[PDB]
């Protein structure tokens, strides 16, 4: 082979793209190992080459092919990297190429896999943004599965830092990203003591992404070998015009809460951080505030009566200002909050009815642990969920209530006013309150409103309204074993019977079924005519 | 006693009243008119003299009625208008409007004098925003459009940075005002392109918070047909640069909306965009189609848009044929990148499955259309790319088969 690579295949012929592609096709052949070897033994012509752009890309292609054939070909790394880094850094201003940067980065990473984290591992992050760089990013992210298997001692200052003086903070961002899993997976040596204070570099602002990730990492770093030092990290952006994105606010506040959870349950900060965390977020910082609040969630009840759970005073303002769906969760995880449980129903209406379902479990928990505030709130929740027409949560409400009226009187008219959506919903409309009457004297106490309502409802039997009739006749068959409503409905059934003179037949016979059963005591008069 | 009751207004009033809907409204309103009528506030100085008067807000909060505000709307609004930071008055006026949305009232045609209390620019936009929000009672009959018409906004969206430093006291107010102005002109090219980009490049620099409401308003205004199909086309897509939402992961949270909104733009400006603009658009979507920042929703939308984009590019490229072939090679390189993403979808085999199926459908239609375009050393590279496509497509169909018509 050795004659080919220089007979009609030297640099002067690499200008032709088809010729180069044919050469790379030969090189790609698995069995052509000697043809690749003739070059693998002579990296000098690559070294002379890579310091033009077309031949640079061709050299990258050929060297990447060689490395793919022989990944162990790191012997020339110590000479190749010197210019590989040069071109890797330079190409950013050259373009920022079809596949060249990804190939070059793959070569750099492969040579890096022969060592743990070092300068080149930092530098290979430089470009990014090209082809979305997912190839190289995944390559390196998977490479931590090998890197993590002792390099941590001073990684913070021999892989980080290094002042590339060309790249931006993304160098620190991605390095911290990959640093976190190594510490999560795996001594509290003295170096960390000094590093925790070297971190800020005694800067005065540190209000950036780097602080966010660094504090997120250090949140678990304070076990054992004070308050003022942590204060410098936690406090800084309380400056007025800064910290406009609550992300950095909540990161520092979460770290502080972790400090509070550790030993620092003090009246200086404990009541200050809480009422300030739940503010200033509207749509996206809500996903950040919840986790920070989770850390204070166990800490606050550790005081409880010592603070009187005074946060009702804060709520008196917050409810007017804006959300408050964090206050009662202490009981759900499990006391005197029933005195203001009314706020849940008070704040609804033009809407987020979900809180009622959430608070039903808390209310039953209160009842088991320790009311008139429940018997009306439950009916209000029931009617408000019925306004949707939903979900088994509405049934869950009553199910939990009965372990230890308004909607009834509303829904008779709510069906009388009938409309396609109403017709569809009619089954749920009736079922919502007809499920309670099967387990309460609600109808037996007074069925006259129902007689007023339902008497003009079964006549609308069609599609889903028929299913409503099926539901209601079932309740009739339970109530009967009221005579006036039975007589009215029997008259309705008889007139429908005479109406025939098969959907009509289906409705007629279903009403006849409703009238029937109930023990034969009442069916004889009906049966007298069924022959026709 | 009246002066110190403000701090204890919760006591002795809820006990001694009940019809306060129509019996103590006529008590609060005169109290408000007697308390707030002085207004010795200051806006360009230190803490104002009236700083001690803030306590009246609780009494304002305790306004009784949600109906029949006709005799008590205009007077209370006007006495506030006498005030001419300015938030000292906005705090009261916002409550006045907040309690004013429900009740029925009239003579709101005083908008022509109200505007004199609104931006002049020789936080104020909040009041017209709540006005247009509860406008359901009267709708455009009160003012037509004049309060926010073209001539008001054509002056560089009526707002521009006057001082480079002063910085929240000025820039935050400007941030809110621009958003409210956009949200009100929503109803109804120099402003909404040039001022749009100029403010994008300068205003959200603090921590990029502005981009949230600004981008939502941009979506809403771009829903309005001609304001999307024709008016913004002057940009030449040059606003697709970094200026749109640069910053922290607030960028990550809002960029999906920005990309979807500009995709909506493209859906229509596909009608007439030139070949170079289409080329740079497909270039950006080449990065989009594989972005890790969001689930396949963005990737699906990007390829779906690319479908009609390449329809238009196929229509255009046949003319002069040379730039046509040039762009053809790179558009098929885009789906070369797509097959390369499939090469990782292979490993991704380890609900979202339905989204992946939809993505496969979309990109299959895309490659079909791309090939249709190509057919309407070229062949050897065609064969190479098709070999890659065939080898990688089975790896996606295998996930397609996971656990049909």
Curated annotation (Swiss-Prot), chain A:
Name of the protein in its database record: Transformation/transcription domain-associated protein
The protein's assembly and partners: Interacts with MYC, E2F1 and E2F4 transcription factors. Interacts directly with p53/TP53. Interacts with GCN5L2. Component of various HAT complexes. Component of the PCAF complex, at least composed of TADA2L/ADA2, SUPT3H, TADA3L/ADA3, TAF5L/PAF65-beta, TAF6L/PAF65-alpha, TAF10/TAFII30, TAF12/TAFII20, TAF9/TAFII31 and TRRAP. Component of the TFTC-HAT complex, at least composed of TAF5L, TAF6L, TADA3L, SUPT3H/SPT3, TAF2/TAFII150, TAF4/TAFII135, TAF5/TAFII100, GCN5L2/GCN5, TAF10 and TRRAP.
Source species, domain of life: Eukaryota
Disorder this protein is connected to according to its UniProt record: Developmental delay with or without dysmorphic facies and autism: An autosomal dominant neurodevelopmental disorder apparent from infancy or early childhood. Some patients present with intellectual disability and renal, cardiac, genitourinary systems, as well as structural brain abnormalities. In some cases, the phenotype is less severe, has no systemic involvement and is characterized by autism spectrum disorder and/or intellectual disability, sometimes associated with epilepsy. Affected individuals manifest variable dysmorphic features. Deafness, autosomal dominant, 75: A form of non-syndromic deafness characterized by late-onset hearing loss that involves mid and high frequencies, and progresses to encompass all frequencies.
Entry comment, domain topic: The PI3K/PI4K domain is required for the recruitment of HAT complexes, and the MYC-dependent transactivation. Although it is strongly related to the PI3/PI4-kinase family, it lacks the typical motifs that constitute the catalytic site of PI3/PI4-kinase proteins, and lacks such activity.
Family indicated by similarity: Belongs to the PI3/PI4-kinase family. TRA1 subfamily.
GN (gene name): TRRAP
Function as written in the Swiss-Prot or TrEMBL entry: Adapter protein, which is found in various multiprotein chromatin complexes with histone acetyltransferase activity (HAT), which gives a specific tag for epigenetic transcription activation. Component of the NuA4 histone acetyltransferase complex which is responsible for acetylation of nucleosomal histones H4 and H2A. Plays a central role in MYC transcription activation, and also participates in cell transformation by MYC. Required for p53/TP53-, E2F1- and E2F4-mediated transcription activation.
Consequence recorded when altering residue 86 to H: In a colorectal adenocarcinoma sample; somatic mutation
Signal peptide extent: none
Location of the protein in the cell: Nucleus
């Amino acid at each position: 082979p050795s004659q080919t690579v220089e007979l009609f295949m030297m640099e002067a012929t690499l200008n032709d793209p088809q010729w180069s592609r044919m050469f790379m096709s030969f090189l790609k052949h698995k069995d052509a190992r000697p043809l690749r070897d003739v070059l693998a033994a002579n990296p000098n012509r690559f070294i002379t080459l890579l310091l033009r752009l077309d031949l640079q890309f061709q050299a990258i292609k050929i060297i990447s092919i060689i490395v793919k054939n022989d990944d162990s070909w790191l012997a020339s790394q110590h000479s190749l990297v010197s210019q590989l880094r040069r071109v890797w850094v330079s190409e950013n201003f050259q373009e920022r190429n079809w596949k060249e940067p990804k190939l070059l980065a793959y070569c750099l990473l492969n040579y890096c896999k022969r060592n743990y984290g070092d300068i080149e591992l930092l530098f290979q992050l430089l470009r990014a943004f090209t082809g979305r760089f997912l190839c190289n990013m995944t390559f390196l992210k998977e490479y931590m599965e090998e890197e993590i298997p002792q390099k941590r001692a001073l990684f913070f200052r021999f892989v980080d830092f290094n002042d590339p003086n060309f790249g931006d903070e993304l160098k620190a961002k991605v390095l911290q990203h990959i640093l976190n899993p190594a510490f999560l997976y795996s001594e509290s040596i003295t170096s960390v003591f000094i590093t925790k204070v070297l971190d800020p570099e005694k800067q005065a602002d540190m209000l950036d992404s780097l602080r966010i990730y660094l504090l997120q990492y250090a949140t678990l770093l304070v076990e054992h070998a004070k308050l003022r030092r942590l204060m410098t990290f936690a406090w800084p952006c309380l400056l007025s015009k800064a910290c406009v994105d609550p992300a950095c606010k909540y990161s520092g506040h979460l770290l502080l809460a972790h400090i509070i959870a550790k030993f620092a349950i003090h009246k200086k900060i404990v009541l200050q951080v809480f009422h300030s965390l739940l503010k200033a977020h509207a749509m996206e910082a809500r996903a950040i505030v919840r986790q920070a609040m989770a850390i204070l969630t166990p800490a606050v009840p550790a005081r409880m009566e010592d603070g009187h759970q005074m946060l009702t005073h804060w709520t008196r303002k917050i409810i007017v200002e804006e959300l408050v769906h964090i206050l009662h969760l202490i009981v759900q995880h499990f006391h005197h909050l029933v005195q203001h449980m009314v706020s849940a129903m008070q704040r609804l209406g033009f809407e987020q009815r979900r809180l009622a379902v959430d608070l039903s479990e808390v209310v039953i928990k209160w009842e088991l642990q320790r009311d008139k505030q429940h018997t009306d709130t439950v009916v209000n929740f029931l009617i408000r969920v019925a306004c949707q027409v939903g979900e088994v949560l509405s049934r869950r409400c009553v199910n939990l209530l009965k372990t230890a009226s308004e909607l009834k009187l509303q829904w008779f008219d709510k069906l009388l006013m009938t409309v396609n959506y109403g017709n569809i919903c009619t089954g749920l409309e009736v079922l919502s309150f007809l499920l309670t009457v099967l387990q309460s004297p609600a109808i037996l106490s007074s069925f006259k409103p129902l007689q007023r309502g339902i008497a003009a409802c079964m006549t609308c039997g069609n599609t889903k309204v028929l299913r409503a009739v099926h539901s209601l006749l079932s309740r009739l068959m339970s109530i009967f074993p009221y005579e006036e409503l039975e007589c009215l409905y029997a008259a309705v059934g008889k007139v429908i019977y005479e109406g025939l003179t098969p959907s009509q037949l289906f409705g007629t016979l279903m009403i006849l079924k409703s009238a029937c059963s109930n023990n034969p005591s009442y069916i004889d008069r009906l049966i007298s005519v069924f022959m026709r | 006693k009246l002066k110190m009751m403000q701090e204890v207004s919760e006591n002795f009033e809820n006990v001694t009243s009940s019809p306060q809907y129509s019996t103590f409204l006529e008590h609060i309103i005169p109290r408000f008119l007697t308390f707030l009528q002085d207004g010795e506030v200051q806006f360009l100085q230190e803490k104002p003299a009236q700083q001690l008067r803030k306590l009246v807000l609780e009494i304002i909060h305790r306004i009784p009625t949600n109906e029949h505000l006709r005799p008590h709307t205009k007077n209370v609004l006007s006495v506030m208008f006498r005030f001419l930071n300015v938030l000292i008055c906005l705090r009261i006026i916002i409550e006045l409007h907040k309690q004013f949305r429900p009740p029925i009232t009239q003579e709101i045609h005083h908008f022509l004098d109200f505007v004199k209390q609104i931006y002049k620019e020789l936080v104020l936009a909040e009041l017209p925003i709540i006005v247009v929000l509860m406008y359901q009672l009267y709708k455009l009959n009160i003012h037509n459009v004049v309060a926010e018409f073209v001539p008001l906004i054509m002056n560089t969206i009526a707002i521009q940075v006057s001082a480079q430093a002063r910085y929240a006291d000025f820039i935050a107010a400007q941030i809110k005002t621009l958003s409210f102005l956009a949200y009100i002109i929503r109803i109804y090219s120099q402003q909404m392109v040039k001022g749009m980009l100029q403010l994008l490049s300068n205003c959200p620099a603090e921590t990029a918070h502005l981009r949230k409401e600004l981008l939502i308003a941009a979506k809403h205004i771009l829903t309005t047909e001609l304001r999307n199909q024709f008016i913004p086309c002057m940009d030449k897509l040059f606003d697709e640069s970094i200026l749109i939402g640069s910053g922290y992961t607030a960028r990550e949270t809002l960029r999906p909306l920005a990309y979807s909104t500009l995709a909506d733009l493209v859906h229509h400006v596909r009608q007439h965009l030139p070949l170079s603009d289409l080329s740079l658009a497909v270039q950006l979507f080449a990065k989009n189609i594989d972005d890790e920042s969001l689930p396949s929703s963005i990737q699906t939308m990007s390829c779906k848009l690319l479908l009609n984009l390449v329809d238009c590019i196929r229509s255009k490229s046949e003319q002069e044929s040379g730039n046509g072939r040039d762009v053809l090679m790179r558009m098929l390189e885009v789906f070369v990148l797509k097959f390369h993403t499939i090469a990782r979808y292979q490993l991704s085999a380890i609900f979202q499955v339905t989204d992946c199926r939809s993505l496969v459908k979309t990109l299959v239609c895309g490659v079909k259309t791309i090939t249709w375009g190509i057919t309407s050393q070229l062949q050897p590279k065609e064969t190479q790319i098709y070999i890659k496509l065939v080898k990688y497509a089975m790896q996606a169909l295998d996930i397609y088969q996971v656990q049909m018509k």
